[PDB]
Design a protein around this motif. Structure first.
Motif, PDB file in Angstrom:
ATOM      1  N   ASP B  28       1.775   9.716 -17.127  1.00  0.00           N
ATOM      2  CA  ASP B  28       0.490  10.320 -17.453  1.00  0.00           C
ATOM      3  C   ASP B  28      -0.235  10.715 -16.174  1.00  0.00           C
ATOM      4  OD1 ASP B  28       1.378   9.262 -19.859  1.00  0.00           O
ATOM      5  OD2 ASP B  28      -0.330   7.935 -20.153  1.00  0.00           O
ATOM      6  N   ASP B  29      -1.410  11.322 -16.372  1.00  0.00           N
ATOM      7  CA  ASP B  29      -2.155  11.904 -15.261  1.00  0.00           C
ATOM      8  C   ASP B  29      -2.503  10.856 -14.216  1.00  0.00           C
ATOM      9  OD1 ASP B  29      -3.634  10.776 -17.303  1.00  0.00           O
ATOM     10  OD2 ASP B  29      -5.456  11.903 -16.820  1.00  0.00           O
ATOM     11  N   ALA B  30      -2.825   9.637 -14.648  1.00  0.00           N
ATOM     12  CA  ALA B  30      -3.206   8.599 -13.695  1.00  0.00           C
ATOM     13  C   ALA B  30      -2.050   8.240 -12.769  1.00  0.00           C
ATOM     14  CB  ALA B  30      -3.700   7.364 -14.444  1.00  0.00           C
ATOM     15  N   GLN B  31      -0.864   7.997 -13.334  1.00  0.00           N
ATOM     16  CA  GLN B  31       0.288   7.665 -12.505  1.00  0.00           C
ATOM     17  C   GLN B  31       0.681   8.833 -11.612  1.00  0.00           C
ATOM     18  OE1 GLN B  31       3.904   6.588 -14.515  1.00  0.00           O
ATOM     19  NE2 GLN B  31       4.159   4.689 -13.348  1.00  0.00           N
ATOM     20  N   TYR B  32       0.637  10.058 -12.144  1.00  0.00           N
ATOM     21  CA  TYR B  32       0.939  11.211 -11.303  1.00  0.00           C
ATOM     22  C   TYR B  32      -0.046  11.321 -10.146  1.00  0.00           C
ATOM     23  CZ  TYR B  32       4.590  13.005 -14.366  1.00  0.00           C
ATOM     24  OH  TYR B  32       5.754  13.168 -15.080  1.00  0.00           O
ATOM     25  N   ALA B  33      -1.335  11.100 -10.410  1.00  0.00           N
ATOM     26  CA  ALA B  33      -2.326  11.171  -9.342  1.00  0.00           C
ATOM     27  C   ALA B  33      -2.074  10.103  -8.291  1.00  0.00           C
ATOM     28  CB  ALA B  33      -3.734  11.031  -9.917  1.00  0.00           C
ATOM     29  N   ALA B  34      -1.721   8.893  -8.729  1.00  0.00           N
ATOM     30  CA  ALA B  34      -1.406   7.839  -7.773  1.00  0.00           C
ATOM     31  C   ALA B  34      -0.225   8.231  -6.894  1.00  0.00           C
ATOM     32  CB  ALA B  34      -1.119   6.531  -8.507  1.00  0.00           C
ATOM     33  N   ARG B  35       0.822   8.797  -7.495  1.00  0.00           N
ATOM     34  CA  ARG B  35       1.999   9.166  -6.712  1.00  0.00           C
ATOM     35  C   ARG B  35       1.697  10.312  -5.748  1.00  0.00           C
ATOM     36  NH1 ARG B  35       6.298  10.403 -10.972  1.00  0.00           N
ATOM     37  NH2 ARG B  35       7.648  10.872  -9.184  1.00  0.00           N
ATOM     38  N   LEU B  36       0.933  11.312  -6.201  1.00  0.00           N
ATOM     39  CA  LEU B  36       0.482  12.367  -5.296  1.00  0.00           C
ATOM     40  C   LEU B  36      -0.297  11.800  -4.118  1.00  0.00           C
ATOM     41  CD1 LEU B  36       0.954  15.518  -5.868  1.00  0.00           C
ATOM     42  CD2 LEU B  36       1.201  14.187  -7.923  1.00  0.00           C
ATOM     43  N   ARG B  37      -1.236  10.888  -4.373  1.00  0.00           N
ATOM     44  CA  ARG B  37      -2.022  10.333  -3.276  1.00  0.00           C
ATOM     45  C   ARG B  37      -1.145   9.545  -2.311  1.00  0.00           C
ATOM     46  NH1 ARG B  37      -7.249   6.836  -2.266  1.00  0.00           N
ATOM     47  NH2 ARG B  37      -8.335   8.462  -3.457  1.00  0.00           N
ATOM     48  N   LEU B  38      -0.214   8.748  -2.842  1.00  0.00           N
ATOM     49  CA  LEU B  38       0.658   7.959  -1.978  1.00  0.00           C
ATOM     50  C   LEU B  38       1.500   8.855  -1.082  1.00  0.00           C
ATOM     51  CD1 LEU B  38       1.970   5.326  -1.062  1.00  0.00           C
ATOM     52  CD2 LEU B  38       3.486   5.480  -3.037  1.00  0.00           C
ATOM     53  N   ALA B  39       2.126   9.883  -1.657  1.00  0.00           N
ATOM     54  CA  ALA B  39       2.927  10.787  -0.840  1.00  0.00           C
ATOM     55  C   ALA B  39       2.064  11.528   0.173  1.00  0.00           C
ATOM     56  CB  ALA B  39       3.684  11.770  -1.727  1.00  0.00           C
ATOM     57  N   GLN B  40       0.869  11.959  -0.238  1.00  0.00           N
ATOM     58  CA  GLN B  40       0.002  12.712   0.660  1.00  0.00           C
ATOM     59  C   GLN B  40      -0.404  11.871   1.862  1.00  0.00           C
ATOM     60  OE1 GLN B  40      -0.943  15.623   2.269  1.00  0.00           O
ATOM     61  NE2 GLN B  40      -0.752  16.232   0.117  1.00  0.00           N
ATOM     62  N   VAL B  41      -0.785  10.613   1.627  1.00  0.00           N
ATOM     63  CA  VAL B  41      -1.159   9.760   2.750  1.00  0.00           C
ATOM     64  C   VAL B  41       0.075   9.381   3.559  1.00  0.00           C
ATOM     65  CG1 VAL B  41      -1.052   7.626   1.415  1.00  0.00           C
ATOM     66  CG2 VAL B  41      -2.515   7.745   3.442  1.00  0.00           C
ATOM     67  N   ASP B  42       1.257   9.403   2.939  1.00  0.00           N
ATOM     68  CA  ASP B  42       2.475   9.101   3.683  1.00  0.00           C
ATOM     69  C   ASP B  42       2.793  10.209   4.681  1.00  0.00           C
ATOM     70  OD1 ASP B  42       5.344   9.391   4.321  1.00  0.00           O
ATOM     71  OD2 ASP B  42       5.722   7.765   2.917  1.00  0.00           O
ATOM     72  N   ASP B  43       2.720  11.473   4.250  1.00  0.00           N
ATOM     73  CA  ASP B  43       3.114  12.562   5.144  1.00  0.00           C
ATOM     74  C   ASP B  43       2.195  12.710   6.351  1.00  0.00           C
ATOM     75  OD1 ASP B  43       5.378  14.060   3.519  1.00  0.00           O
ATOM     76  OD2 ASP B  43       3.741  13.771   2.101  1.00  0.00           O
ATOM     77  N   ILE B  51      -4.255   4.308   8.619  1.00  0.00           N
ATOM     78  CA  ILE B  51      -4.436   4.320   7.172  1.00  0.00           C
ATOM     79  C   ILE B  51      -5.322   3.145   6.786  1.00  0.00           C
ATOM     80  CG2 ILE B  51      -2.231   5.457   6.805  1.00  0.00           C
ATOM     81  CD1 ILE B  51      -1.137   2.733   5.890  1.00  0.00           C
ATOM     82  N   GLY B  52      -6.183   3.356   5.794  1.00  0.00           N
ATOM     83  CA  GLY B  52      -7.072   2.314   5.326  1.00  0.00           C
ATOM     84  C   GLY B  52      -6.736   1.844   3.925  1.00  0.00           C
ATOM     85  N   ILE B  53      -6.857   0.531   3.731  1.00  0.00           N
ATOM     86  CA  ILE B  53      -6.551  -0.102   2.452  1.00  0.00           C
ATOM     87  C   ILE B  53      -7.635  -1.125   2.147  1.00  0.00           C
ATOM     88  CG2 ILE B  53      -4.074   0.236   2.801  1.00  0.00           C
ATOM     89  CD1 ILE B  53      -3.847  -2.730   3.389  1.00  0.00           C
TER      90      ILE B  53
ATOM     91  N   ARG D 123      -7.781   4.449 -13.853  1.00  0.00           N
ATOM     92  CA  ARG D 123      -7.625   5.085 -12.552  1.00  0.00           C
ATOM     93  C   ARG D 123      -6.755   4.281 -11.603  1.00  0.00           C
ATOM     94  NH1 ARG D 123      -9.266   5.589  -7.138  1.00  0.00           N
ATOM     95  NH2 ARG D 123      -9.672   3.346  -7.347  1.00  0.00           N
ATOM     96  N   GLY D 124      -7.073   3.008 -11.395  1.00  0.00           N
ATOM     97  CA  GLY D 124      -6.329   2.200 -10.454  1.00  0.00           C
ATOM     98  C   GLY D 124      -7.218   1.328  -9.595  1.00  0.00           C
ATOM     99  N   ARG D 125      -6.598   0.427  -8.837  1.00  0.00           N
ATOM    100  CA  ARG D 125      -7.304  -0.533  -7.999  1.00  0.00           C
ATOM    101  C   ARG D 125      -6.999  -0.310  -6.526  1.00  0.00           C
ATOM    102  NH1 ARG D 125     -10.143  -3.193  -7.674  1.00  0.00           N
ATOM    103  NH2 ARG D 125      -9.936  -5.424  -8.135  1.00  0.00           N
ATOM    104  N   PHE D 126      -6.661   0.918  -6.155  1.00  0.00           N
ATOM    105  CA  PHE D 126      -6.160   1.209  -4.825  1.00  0.00           C
ATOM    106  C   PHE D 126      -7.084   2.177  -4.104  1.00  0.00           C
ATOM    107  CE2 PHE D 126      -4.709   5.405  -5.978  1.00  0.00           C
ATOM    108  CZ  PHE D 126      -4.445   5.288  -7.323  1.00  0.00           C
ATOM    109  N   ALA D 127      -7.138   2.035  -2.781  1.00  0.00           N
ATOM    110  CA  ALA D 127      -7.876   2.956  -1.920  1.00  0.00           C
ATOM    111  C   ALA D 127      -7.013   3.235  -0.695  1.00  0.00           C
ATOM    112  CB  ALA D 127      -9.231   2.386  -1.521  1.00  0.00           C
ATOM    113  N   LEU D 128      -6.192   4.274  -0.776  1.00  0.00           N
ATOM    114  CA  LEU D 128      -5.395   4.732   0.353  1.00  0.00           C
ATOM    115  C   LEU D 128      -6.054   5.980   0.918  1.00  0.00           C
ATOM    116  CD1 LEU D 128      -1.590   4.317  -0.412  1.00  0.00           C
ATOM    117  CD2 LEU D 128      -2.769   3.715   1.702  1.00  0.00           C
ATOM    118  N   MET D 129      -6.357   5.959   2.210  1.00  0.00           N
ATOM    119  CA  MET D 129      -7.039   7.068   2.850  1.00  0.00           C
ATOM    120  C   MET D 129      -6.493   7.267   4.253  1.00  0.00           C
ATOM    121  SD  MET D 129     -10.719   5.619   4.097  1.00  0.00           S
ATOM    122  CE  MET D 129     -11.438   5.429   2.469  1.00  0.00           C
ATOM    123  N   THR D 130      -6.695   8.471   4.774  1.00  0.00           N
ATOM    124  CA  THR D 130      -6.290   8.823   6.122  1.00  0.00           C
ATOM    125  C   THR D 130      -7.296   9.801   6.703  1.00  0.00           C
ATOM    126  OG1 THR D 130      -4.469   9.622   7.507  1.00  0.00           O
ATOM    127  CG2 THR D 130      -4.870  10.771   5.426  1.00  0.00           C
ATOM    128  N   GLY D 131      -7.358   9.846   8.030  1.00  0.00           N
ATOM    129  CA  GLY D 131      -8.284  10.733   8.702  1.00  0.00           C
ATOM    130  C   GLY D 131      -7.990  12.193   8.442  1.00  0.00           C
TER     131      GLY D 131
END
Lengths: 133, 74, 133, 133, 133, 133, 133
Positions: B28-43, B51-53, D123-131
């Motif tokens: 669903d949209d939530a999981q897809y958004a999570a995967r997009l964000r993870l890959a985007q911050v990875d590249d 990176i901040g967590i 939505r989720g419980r995560f906050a991944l961010m980059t500059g």
């Protein structure tokens, strides 16, 4: 929710599980089940959706006392009575039924643990994912 | 040779742990958004980037293994 | 629905194993059994299916006292009465029975332990898997 | 101001979720919801926004007995009465309900826990961010 | 502070949140708000500034009990009474409400935690800087 | 001597912030405030100097019940009355309020905590030093 | 000590700070301040010498109870009375005022910690040396 037959079936199954709910007005049951349908995924179960939704609604309402409110009550939702006694007639002492050292919050009621084990049977509780493209 | 190249690819791995990630719906949209964000911050990560967590919910660790002796074996 | 005579045999064996359930109306037990059948597999046992399903349904019923009276029950499943006393007539106290130490929810009642050993002997407690190609 | 009929739906939803709030004057509920809307996002839920805001408002109200009566509540919020007894008439004691472990303030009340699970689901419980550049 | 309308709005919001303040003299509430507004920074919130002022003022006044001083009181700010009882008429026992091993002092009252979360959303609890030139 | 009208403003601020101080004799507040003048510096705040000195003197007065009565007090400052009772009239028990955990004594009373926050914002809570050639 | 006018100023400041000292005869206070002045080093302050002497004298006299000995007392310096009561008239229970796990021996009374803060203000609690030649 998608119809009314499913809602009625869920309420009836919940009442079969807990016969004490037959005397409670069904309106609160509709409210609780339609609030609990927000958490369950019918893609995963697709056959025992009614059973799972009733189980989760029961656990959700019996977490710490949320259905405890009938038409007459006060703001006792922050505090629990530990004992009550007339001076020379009777005395009575209460206590919590289960300790929850785990903190996962989902194993707070028997119905919660049942729902977790049913979730593991239908589709594992894992969450493994990778970045696409 | 193929196993050597595979070991070269598998030198270093990163693990990202988020409590409650099991609640995510499948496909669903939530999981897809999570995967997009993870890959985007990875590249966009690297030596010159950070990176901040969140401390309470997620942990980010890195695992690595050594590689040596492969040229002699071949 | 799973086979009718098998279900009848299950409820019969459960009743003869625990005599106190003979007074409970049959349909509540029917519902409990058809709800508990969602957990076990068939080909795992294929001989003692009735035994295993009865054990698991019994464990679910006796998990945290979820199975209560029909109308005599009062709408408090989040609270337990540790003790009670009348002034000059009698007094009584209660307490926990098992004191679980592992948080498995199968090692919390004797019935769960019995079913756990049955499963371990028949198939095992292991799950080894690898990806398909 | 957040949308009027949506606010009305939220307040009536929390009222029929907890029937004990029916006797409370409405404008206090309006103030509580208009204050609690500052926390939840909008596009994250965008479907169950009413349910989420009702849950969070209820959690905020029942956090640590922040919501009191109108005047009957004595000006003592930093002090709690654990027990009291009249001479030869009656007696009573009290205690805590939840016994939180992590100090997140979110897994401290059942409403907060339910809101937390809904957020994790939606939505989720995560906050991944980059500059950014 | 910059004018009187913002103070009036903040104090009215305080009274709306806690109805018990309707009896407190108005000059004392002005004093407390003028003390508390020295802590909130307008450039951060800039939209819910009055709400931030109100929440932080409630926290600052209920921290350990400082508003407890009416026009008649003694030097009981270094001590707390845990019980009081007439020898043969009635008895009462008190107790502190919130355990705070964290020591942050912002998680001491519900209002404090509420303001902490509002700050967390409006602008994160971080402070990352580097030396100039 | 510290400025006279500023001292008057400080003592009046103290009196209007803690209403129970109105009964205290006039000279003792001068004594306490001129003692508190020695701890705080000027140019760090230079705007809320009056507020800061009032807060620090309040913390000094309420540190460990340091501020006492005039003559009614016995020569017992090292010994605190935990509880007392008359035979057939009343009984009372006392207890601690704060239970400090850091051994800083700035984090021992609410006034000190507020002063610490104000200092941290106005100047900071650090000291970085280097040698001079 | 070097003169008598500073001695008079110091004892007067002691009396101003603690009104209960007006009853004790002067000679005992003279002896106490004479013995207390040895530990204070004038070369650190140069300016608040009378205040430092007053603080040190108060702390030194209230260490564990040393001024408790009036003209008629017994060898009760080794033990502390914890409770005293008549059989059927009244009761009274005592207790220690502070807990001092630190072992610094100066963080035992409020006056001591006040003196430590003043000392650190005038010249930090550090001490660094280098071997000469």
């Amino acid at each position: 929710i998608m119809n009314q037959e499913t809602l009625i079936a869920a309420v009836e199954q919940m009442r079969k599980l807990v016969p004490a709910l037959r005397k409670v007005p069904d309106e609160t049951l509709y409210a609780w089940v339609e609030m609990a349908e927000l958490f369950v995924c019918q893609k995963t179960f697709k056959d025992a959706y009614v059973k799972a939704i009733a189980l989760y609604a029961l656990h959700l309402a019996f977490l710490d006392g949320a259905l405890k409110g009938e038409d007459e009550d006060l703001e006792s939702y922050s505090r629990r009575v530990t004992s009550f006694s007339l001076s020379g007639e009777f005395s009575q002492t209460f206590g919590e039924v289960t300790k929850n050292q785990s903190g996962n919050m989902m194993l707070s009621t028997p119905w919660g643990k049942m729902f977790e084990q049913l979730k593991a049977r239908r589709r594992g509780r894992f969450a493994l994912m990778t970045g696409l493209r | 040779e193929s196993l050597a190249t595979q070991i070269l690819r598998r030198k270093q791995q990163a693990v990202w742990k988020v409590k409650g990630l099991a609640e995510m719906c499948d496909d669903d949209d939530a999981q897809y958004a999570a995967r997009l964000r993870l890959a985007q911050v990875d590249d966009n990560s690297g030596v010159g980037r950070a990176i901040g967590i969140d401390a309470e919910t997620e942990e980010y660790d890195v695992l690595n293994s050594d590689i040596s002796g492969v040229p002699e074996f071949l």
